[PDB]
Amino acid sequence: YPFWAQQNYANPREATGRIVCANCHLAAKPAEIEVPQAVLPDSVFKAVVKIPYDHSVQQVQADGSKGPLNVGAVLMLPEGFTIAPEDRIPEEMKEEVGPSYLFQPYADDKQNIVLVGPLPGDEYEEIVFPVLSPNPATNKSVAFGKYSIHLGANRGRGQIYPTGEKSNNAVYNASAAGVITAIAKADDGSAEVKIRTEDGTTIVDKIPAGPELIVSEGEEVAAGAALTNNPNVGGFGQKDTEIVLQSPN
Numbered sequence: 001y002p003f004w005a006q007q008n009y010a011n012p013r014e015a016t017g018r019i020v021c022a023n024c025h026l027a028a029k030p031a032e033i034e035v036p037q038a039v040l041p042d043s044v045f046k047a048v049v050k051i052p053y054d055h056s057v058q059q060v061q062a063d064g065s066k067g068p069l070n071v072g073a074v075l076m077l078p079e080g081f082t083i084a085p086e087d088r089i090p091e092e093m094k095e096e097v098g099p100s101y102l103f104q105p106y107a108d109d110k111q112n113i114v115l116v117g118p119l120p121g122d123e124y125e126e127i128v129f130p131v132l133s134p135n136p137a138t139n140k141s142v143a144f145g146k147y148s149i150h151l152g153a154n155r156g157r158g159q160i161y162p163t164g165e166k167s168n169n170a171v172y173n174a175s176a177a178g179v180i181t182a183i184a185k186a187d188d189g190s191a192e193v194k195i196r197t198e199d200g201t202t203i204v205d206k207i208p209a210g211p212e213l214i215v216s217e218g219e220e221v222a223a224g225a226a227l228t229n230n231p232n233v234g235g236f237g238q239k240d241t242e243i244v245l246q247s248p249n
């Protein structure tokens with residue numbers, strides 16, 4: 001969740017440009033963002049974000065059962081830019097943009113970094129951010145010019161928790177090489193795979209409900225080999241765009 005990015009990373013964009021959601025949402029999927037080519041100072045414009053996925057495909061949920069996906073994103077605007085206050089949103093636009101409550105600043109001193117979600121993916125095919133450009137004439141920290149906007153967008157449950165533990169929406173691997181002597185399947189959906197190592201020892205790898213086993217009893221497996229499919233059907237992607245903070249006329 002966006003909140004887990006806030007708790008663990010003061011800066012959501014690493015030196016390489018990689019956005020921190022990627023540290024836990026391991027699969028890559030597209031991220032789209034559309035903004036006007038240029039905007040006048042102290043003006044409101046729309047930033048349209050899309051996070052594609054096949055709405056007919058369900059994902060493994062926290063309880064292991066199949067369900068819908070939720071989406072979320074971090075939109076990094078240039079210095080001075082912020083989500084537009086409601087009273088600054090023009091009339092014809094108010095019904096074209098997301099409601100104010102959808103948007104959360106990354107931090108008090110990073111209001112140009114906007115977070116949205118989790119939101120139900122089936123209801124938000126486009127997330128439209130109403131953005132207020134700054135005014136260089138009265139704000140010395142910002143100047144007219146061309147700037148970059150960075151988008152990080154996710155759909156679906158991540159693979160690793162803030163605790164460092166893997167979620168049930170990930171591949172589980174053989175903790176050691178050997179032969180599978182048994183597969184204890186709880187009607188809980190979870191499982192325990194007993195592996196007989198090449199010299200007597202037997203180890204047990206626990207797998208939560210959700211992932212599908214792709215090994216069978218009596219089967220040999222290498223260390224690190226996959227015991228399950230990769231049930232993940234979502235992903236996180238990034239996209240950059242530019243915008244010109246323009247001088248009137």
Ligand code: HEC
Nearest residue numbers: 001002005021024069070071072073074156157158160162
């Ligand atoms: C690891 C510490 C994470 C970071 C950093 C971020 N997210 Fe995450 N997110 C993570 C997990 C393990 C889960 C699943 C929780 C569960 O058990 O259900 C999530 C979930 C989301 C969701 C909901 C997806 C869905 O339910 O379909 C969204 C929309 C989401 N996360 C977005 C997101 C963004 C945009 C992040 C970076 C700004 C981000 N997450 C960071 C793990 C972690």
Ligand SMILES: [Zn+2]
Nearest residue numbers: 051052053125
């Ligand atoms: Zn869609």
Ligand SMILES: [Zn+2]
Nearest residue numbers: 076148149150
């Ligand atoms: Zn930048």
